[PDB]
């Protein structure tokens, strides 16, 4: 019952929600209208790390809900089921979606965080990823 | 086109996915079986900060998808639509769900991150939240 952990986890969740809103409201690209961030997370999971059940757990979704969500991405021909696999279009989509995101966050963070803070964040987050990621 | 920003944002997204998996796979509480993390995010958004359209943007979901998701939470009587509002049950659920989460993360982080790192994370994340959160 550590107040510091309550606040750390709450802040993490807030940075996700408020960053998500900032990006959706602030970029112009058609892909950031066509594809939700939750859809982009399916594509980036297949790209990097996927069965329907594993996807559900990694996205924090009930297994029962994941079928109907995958249907929309199959209809858009960004994934296929064979495991889930990216199509060439899906790879093209998630690379450009990510480029739009990274360019936008880099321009927002200019003159608000310094190089020292960015470099520290990389070491802190690699460490946190290694703690959390199960074998 | 800053490599450091690409890696920072990618790491943030990975800590979300791998932390989500760690918690779902590692805690015992009935609420962390009944309620998905995505459902818990609707309850915590109403609790803290909600129209259907605002919720969609903050969760990174298409507006078209949010109705059918809210239906399950209405059927469980954790929310009502009147804006979205928490019920007493919804408040009870999200307080216990959060307690389970915070207790678990605090025990996982014991002897893996030090007090200095936790306290630094609070200052860094308050700053990042303030940059991202729109008016
Ligand atoms: C002090 C901060 C330095 C790190 C530089 C920025 C890291 C950004 C991490 C939070 C990003 C939140 C955006 C969520 C949107 C998304 O990933 O789709
Ligand atoms: C060096 C780190 C110190 C901070 C202490 C822990 C902060 C944890 C932040 C990542 C939590 C990820 C868990 C996601 C699950 C969820 O919130 O439902």
Numbering used by the authors:
A (entry chain A), B (entry chain A): 1 to 49, 52 to 84, 93 to 145
Give sentences from the paper.
Multiple antibiotic-resistance regulator (MarR) family proteins are dimeric transcription factors.
Specifically, the side chains of Val15, Val23, Trp32, Leu111, Ile115, Met119, Val123, Ile128, Phe131, Phe135, Leu138 and Leu142 in chain A, and Ile5, Ala8, Val9 and Phe12 in chain B, form a hydrophobic cavity. The palmitic acid molecule was probably derived from the LB medium used during cell culture and protein production; palmitic acid was not supplied in the crystallization step. Accordingly, the B-factor distribution among PaMarR, BsMarR and StMarR was analysed. As shown in Fig. 4(e), the DNA-binding domain of PaMarR exhibits relatively high B-factor values, with a disordered region between the β1 and β2 strands.
